[PDB]
């Protein structure tokens, strides 16, 4: 996250870190046994870390659970990133508490202009590299689809939504992928891609979660 601020200790309880030796992607806890992330964050072996704030220090509130099932959307395109969404079933249910909680799936697609909260442990620099210890937060609005398309000519599908500022300055970055974009208590987006981080005319592109609620529920009930 570039241009953000450190999130208040356990104010983002649904945020998880995907780890395979080191943190490589984020995710969101949607129920006591399922995590939702981006399909491009796929790995054959993944350990999910919940209750994290400082990913580099053992604080005492974290839960470490291995992924038992990793299911990517059947229509995921690694080239265009269309349908960049994936579900992870945990080895065992997690213990829900003040530091570890679930986030609600969308009731409907949020309109442009809606204010959202993006979070992650990704790069904080547009130029250079600075990996934070602490979880970063960023308040940003959902952009009109026309501005999204104008920023990325012919690269935006109906399953993508732009979030951020057309002037740059604030944006998600490498290490944020798979993370949450929550608007009014509902998960409306998943950090997916963008050209660089926080560059003008190139705001972040996110997977439109509201287009996958039924697929998500159907998959969870079948697995």
């Amino acid at each position: 996250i570039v241009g953000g601020y450190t999130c208040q200790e356990n104010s983002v309880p649904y945020q998880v870190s995907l780890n395979s030796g080191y943190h490589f992607c984020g995710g969101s806890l949607i129920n006591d046994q399922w995590v939702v992330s981006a399909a491009h964050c796929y790995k054959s072996r993944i350990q999910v870390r919940l209750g994290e704030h400082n990913i580099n220090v053992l604080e005492g509130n974290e839960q470490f659970v291995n992924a038992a099932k990793i299911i990517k959307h059947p229509n995921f395109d690694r080239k265009t990133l269309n349908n960049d969404i994936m579900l992870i079933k945990l080895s065992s249910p997690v213990k829900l508490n003040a530091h570890v909680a679930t986030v609600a799936l969308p009731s409907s697609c949020a309109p442009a202009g809606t204010q959202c909260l993006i979070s992650g442990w990704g790069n904080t620099l547009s130029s250079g590299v600075n990996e934070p210890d602490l979880l970063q937060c960023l308040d940003a609005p959902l952009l009109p689809q026309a501005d999204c398309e104008a920023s990325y000519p012919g690269k935006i599908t109906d399953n993508m939504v732009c979030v951020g500022f057309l002037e740059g300055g604030k944006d998600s970055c490498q290490g944020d992928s798979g993370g949450p974009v929550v608007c009014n208590g509902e998960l409306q987006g998943i950090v997916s891609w963008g050209y660089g981080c926080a560059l003008p005319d190139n705001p972040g592109v996110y997977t439109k979660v509201c287009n996958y609620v039924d697929w998500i529920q159907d998959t969870i009930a079948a697995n």
Binding site: H40, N123, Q174, G175
Partner: protein, 41 residues
């Protein structure tokens, strides 16, 4: 090294000598290896 448009944080190798860089997770170029040995070959 080409990080790519995706925002994952995956460590990959690239030739300078063979060194590391953060790969985004998608649309990798040729100068992107999973190991140093394969990179030096």
């Amino acid at each position: 090294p080409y990080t790519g448009p995706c925002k994952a944080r995956i460590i990959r190798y690239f030739y300078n000598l063979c060194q590391t860089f953060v790969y985004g997770g998608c649309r990798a170029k040729r100068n992107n290896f999973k190991s140093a040995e394969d990179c030096m070959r």
